[PDB]
Amino acid sequence: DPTIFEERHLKYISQLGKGNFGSVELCRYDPLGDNTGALVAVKQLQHSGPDQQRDFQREIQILKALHSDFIVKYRGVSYGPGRQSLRLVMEYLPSGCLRDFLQRHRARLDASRLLLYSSQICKGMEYLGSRRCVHRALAARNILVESEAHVKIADFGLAKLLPLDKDYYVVRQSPIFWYAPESLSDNIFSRQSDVWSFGVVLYELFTYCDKSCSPSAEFLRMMGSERDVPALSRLLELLEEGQRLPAPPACPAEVHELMKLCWAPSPQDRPSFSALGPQLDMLWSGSR
Ligand SMILES: N#C/C=C/c1ccc(-c2nc3cnc4[nH]ccc4c3n2C2CCCCC2)o1
Ligand SMILES: NC(=O)Nc1ccccc1
Structure with missing residues (x-):
């Protein structure tokens, strides 16, 4: 699946936006580990209980199903052992x-x-x-x-x-x-x-x-x-x-x-x- 991004190859760069329960971050997906990989926007949760995690899963399934020129593009997800480790990977504009x-x-x-x-x-x-x-x-x-x-x-x-x-x-x-x-x-x-x-x-x-x-x-x-x-x-x-x-x-x-x-x-x-x-x-x- 090219829609699965490996958490260990996501390199944090900066914050694009913030809400009460999440942030969108600029990251590089750098599987070669030489800082040449593509830039992406990655959403993850903070200060989140089940409701926020549940809303986030919905957000992922929604965006993943939309294919419009006027809707920001879903790229994939990432995850790891971590409790709040689920991430949504989008195009970076x-x-x-x-x-x-x-x-x-x-x-x-x-x-x-x-x-x-x-x-x-x-x-x-x-x-x-x-x-x-x-x-x-x-x-x-x-x-x-x-x-x-x-x-x-x-x-x-x-x-x-x-x-x-x-x-x-x-x-x-x-x-x-x-x-x-x-x-x-x-x-x-x-x-x-x-x-x-x-x-x-x-x-x-x-x-x-x-x-x-x-x-x-x-x-x-x-x-x-x-x-x-x-x-x-x-x-x-x-x-x-x-x-x-x-x-x-x-x-x-x-x-x-x-x-x-x-x-x-x-x-x-x-x-x-x-x-x-x-x-x-x-x-x-x-x-x-
Ligand atoms: N007023 C004001 C300032 C708004 C602002 C500053 C930076 C961004 C922003 N750049 C992005 C670049 N690539 C991206 N891909 C997906 C979301 C995304 C980007 N956002 C998000 C748009 C809304 C959600 C959080 C920031 O918005
Ligand atoms: N829709 C609309 O007119 N909203 C509104 C009205 C007065 C003040 C601020 C916002």
Whole structure:
């Protein structure tokens, strides 16, 4: 099996990302032991009990089964005698995440390129949808840059498959400003709750992930004068009153319209990724 990587030939280099229960590390797979082997991204767990190990095994099986140009590529696993020694080996994308890329190259990325990224993310999300996978972490920081015109969805740590007989599932630290109100209120997740997140992703792209325009900064602006109202409680009120993130300056009207539709109160009033994609394509392809 070329998908089995020998733990002893994985040489640690640096950290790519960190969560509460895991890290993704840059490593070299160096079976010749002369430091010429290929670089890979390797996820492993820390501070993990059975639930986290169980979620990690699911993550491995999910990603291994996805074959899309817009989803980060599974390469294999590693293991050893060690208790927490199971690792997920993925492709390494050295241009990093889209959030950083947009902040760094803002000046040279026009609305046409942002449209292109939007279209690609949407297609990877359509691909997930057709496999009944709810991603749950869809944000610019979890999208990778393969090249200047090619992005890929990553961080499957929270991804979960829908049952064959329901179109949602329920769970028992969430990025609150990316989450659908039913997910924050009632822990209901669906492909339509990923549509909501995608709308915040649009927001990010067309603000170039600028920190002064971030969802959290806008929230603090909209918050009103009572600054000791717990964020989640006040966000739920604001969303229930019909308040939404404002249109960025870079935003064409049509993209702002799609954002607002992604943020329809009822999940069932939100467009599917299949309905969004052709609209983003009209705009993108029509902006070449
Ligand atoms: N804001 C912000 C910063 C985000 C950031 C910095 C570095 C990375 C990152 N580079 C990677 C390169 N090859 C990779 N293969 C699979 C995941 C992966 C890489 N990630 C992960 C993406 C999300 C999960 C953890 C880091 O993201
Ligand atoms: N989807 C959406 O509009 N979310 C939101 C609204 C107000 C402040 C922060 C985030």
